[PDB]
Design a protein around this nucleic acid. Sequence first.
RNA 1: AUAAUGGUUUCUUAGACGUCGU
DNA 2: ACGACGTCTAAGAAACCATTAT
Lengths: 469, 573
Amino acid sequence: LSQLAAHSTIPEPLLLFKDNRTDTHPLRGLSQYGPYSACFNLPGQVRLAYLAPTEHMRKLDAIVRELQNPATPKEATNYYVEYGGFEKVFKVPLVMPQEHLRCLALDECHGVAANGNGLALADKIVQSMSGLFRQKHAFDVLLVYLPASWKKCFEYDGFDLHDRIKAKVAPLNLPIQIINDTALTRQCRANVMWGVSVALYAKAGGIPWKLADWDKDEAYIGLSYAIKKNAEGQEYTTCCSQVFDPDGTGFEFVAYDTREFITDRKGNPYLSYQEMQSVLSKSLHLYQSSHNGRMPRKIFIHKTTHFTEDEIQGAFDSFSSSTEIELVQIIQSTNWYGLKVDGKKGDKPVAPASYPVDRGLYQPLTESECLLWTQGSVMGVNQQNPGQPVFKEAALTPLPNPIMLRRFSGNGGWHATCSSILALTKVDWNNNTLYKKLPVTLVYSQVFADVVKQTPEIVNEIYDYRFFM
Amino acid sequence: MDVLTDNEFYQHYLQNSQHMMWFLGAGTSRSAGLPTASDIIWDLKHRYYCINNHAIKSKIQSYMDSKGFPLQWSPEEYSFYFELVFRDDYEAQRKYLLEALASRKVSLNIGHRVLAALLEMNQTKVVFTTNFDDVIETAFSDISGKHLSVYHLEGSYAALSALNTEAFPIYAKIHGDFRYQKIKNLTPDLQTNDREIHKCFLAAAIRFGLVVSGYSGRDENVMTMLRAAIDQNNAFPHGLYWTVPSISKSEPAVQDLITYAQGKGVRAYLVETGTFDEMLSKIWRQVKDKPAAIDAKVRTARVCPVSIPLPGPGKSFPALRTNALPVVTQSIRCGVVTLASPITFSELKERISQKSPKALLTYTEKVLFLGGEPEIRKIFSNDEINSIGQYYIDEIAQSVAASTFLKSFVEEAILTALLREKPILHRVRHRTHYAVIPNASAKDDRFLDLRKAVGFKGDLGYITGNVTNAKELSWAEAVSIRLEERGGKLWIMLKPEIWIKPLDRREEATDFIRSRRRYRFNQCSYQILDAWIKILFGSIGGGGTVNISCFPDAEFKAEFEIGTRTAFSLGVG
RNA sequence: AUAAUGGUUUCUUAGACGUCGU
DNA sequence: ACGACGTCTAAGAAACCATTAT
Ligand SMILES: NC(=O)c1ccc[n+]([C@@H]2O[C@H](COP(=O)([O-])OP(=O)(O)OC[C@H]3O[C@@H](n4cnc5c(N)ncnc54)[C@H](O)[C@@H]3O)[C@@H](O)[C@H]2O)c1
């Protein structure tokens, strides 16, 4: 026949805010209740400093003046709520820079604008930013403006200016927010305000929200790769890993380099038994060191490629003999898309539904394969209409697309896997929309790999969350 | 400055491993589930502060710093915080320390099993430690089936004699500086037993070489014993190796001990091998004469293949309609042309492109074809061919899943059968197949429903035309057809699309395509898919199946029984 | 790079078969 | 056994355009 067993829907995850109030809408929850960190006052204040040319300094200042005043959404008004100002949503004042926190690079900016400089631009920028190396207790986050002329240096077949600046700034322990010409445009101010205020609060040291279903004994790890493309006849590959909690914080990650990087120059994104074992052992060590030596009872590992013979055994030989391990591969491209059909209502026969399939639907296909949506109709978050769904990608695709899960290990059911992935989708503080296509584990592994790729040396160290977000 | 490398402390242990002693610590047990000293320190400090979040570590640490507590990571916090939290309550202290270091998780890891295995065979003789748990004993008992000889402060009086009678393996649990109370307040001559056990360590270290893993230097009696052992002549003839997870947090006390050992003259290095499990696994990799039984217990065996049973049909009605059509056919007959000399796929493709045959061909261990004998006799001269037979393909699902060439061959046989005897076009782009609508014949009734699906507000639409800002381009409505094997079944995936006439000139009509498909929401897409399915398979939705034939008037044809109803599912309960 | 992710063009990787020579 | 290059399919990273939620 053509009956595809039976599908199930994962209910939309709830988020946790100040005083343990729950809401599925992040911006609405932040507006009504406030950030999660406000309960114990984790960030005392958010102090900013500027780093941009004077002829482009004023406009940067302008954006700060826009971050402490209300705004109204002109686009996507079905989801976005009214912005109330920084000391109305996050309960913490946004402190302007003083006279000594207005650094400049005047003679060094327009020259590289008129030139096509690469690495020297980045190291000169970092040197200019090094003048305040002592008085680092004067601000929390820096706002840096790369002009529309620096676009030529921005990147050319390889080297990336933003990635390399972030890489050189991470050891200096200071978060950075880069403002381009796009943030000062788009005719929808509320979008930019909601996207920058949350990022600044997170980079200051706060936790804007959290997952409500946090009372489980689980942990989550992600693995992703990136092509290095050195100017030669070869092609390097780099990988990274992270650890997350059921509440979804995961503030650290291990930046380990696969084996001896002297005469290896790996050509495919597949770790050997020893390399996978080393990475997972170091990840477990970091998780234990961050949680007072507590070992999770169950581990989820997500990867973009399949698990080879060596990788599964290396994963099983990194944890205890009584910890349940579930290895999942996530495939972004699929031949299925699926449509929603409403049932027979009052004097109304079955017919195709107006809005698309629900977000948390999952369909079993094979004894080891499943289709998860993570994209589609969402109920209860519409602002104007009270009972109309919201499809967030309506301006790009008429219909949502699912993902595939291959589940190389484990013995449990699909519900736990799909619930964990759907919950992990909703905790990206760099993203100002409702959710993402992929869980935060894969996203963060990809971004960490992209940053680590642009580095001449090994860098076997453990870095921080906010330094790359 | 004399610090060995990770790889340099792997050939030395490979060469001489019998003259090696170990001094374990709390960190080596951390991966077994038992928290180390620092984890208890943060617990007691948080308990003094009164499931609580670990995100307020910095504030409580600063409040500690304000009062004037000794220091962070200083070798004084253990006893101080234990006394502060538990006052003089000895029984409560024992109850606490017996609950967080109990056989709770006490689950073995790879390093503990490797160490137990190395204790089984005569590779490592004596192992010292400061722990008072049963991780090593449990691992040894599991791997061997026997019981280890453990000497501790419960009437051993045999360690030094054991070294002389060579009663290996010898596991000596030592009290240290803080096990349940301080070492000072043990009146009943228990300090003399500790002194005897320590005195055994001097003779133990005279002959062997030391490898210290998972130790931080917290204790004072342990450090005094190590210094006294160093003071002995030619102590540690094979050298001393202190392995740490990272040099950046390398315990200035440990650094001072290494400096002293170097100054007095000792092959002492501060080695960095990462974690305990990592180092033990890497050591286990280069081991000779491994018994078959031991290797099964040490490394985790093959894990069973994953199998999650599929649920049954559902009953809720917010239904889900997919785009995949089932294929019921599972047995077809093709042709085989035995050749005098073997050829390659590239040569076959070139010969196919030479003269256009009314047949399909592919190359495996034998060349397979579908069509007519005169066609292949045109593509292949009579001199080279010897005999022409048949090749059965049973259970096409498994053959397609296993072999890749058969996938493409059956896909092309199916699409040739589908598009045969119909006005629909046939186009290929990046190996994907399309069913574009002809511009000349895009007015008859067979496409009328499709027009109704692409209109607006009930008005009719256009299924062919020309791009707006282009006086040479043209566009039509198409659909991509793929064949996918999943779960042992064959599906045909259909996806509506828009085709641009000059294939190399498709980037000049991207905006037109995006504008054309912008409001093609759930209902419009449903109607478009229904119209396309009706166009391709003739019979409207609800029909059971239709048989399609490829090369019907040929010796080696292809009959298929594709199903018209698309796969769907209902909700549980 | 406030963001979301859809297209287009190239580039690889993995697996599976084949021929030759070694 | 095993080194070269062909063939096929499946899947993804890089880099550049585009528009903003019935
Ligand atoms: N399992 C036990 O018996 C236990 C438990 C807690 C405390 N203690 C007490 O602690 C006291 C001092 O012992 P200690 O110096 O070992 O305490 P410690 O906590 O200071 O030792 C930790 C050291 O091991 C390292 N380490 C941590 N995790 C590791 C890993 N996964 N692999 C390898 N190394 C790792 C750490 O960096 C550190 O140098 C003992 O007297 C002992 O009585 C014992």
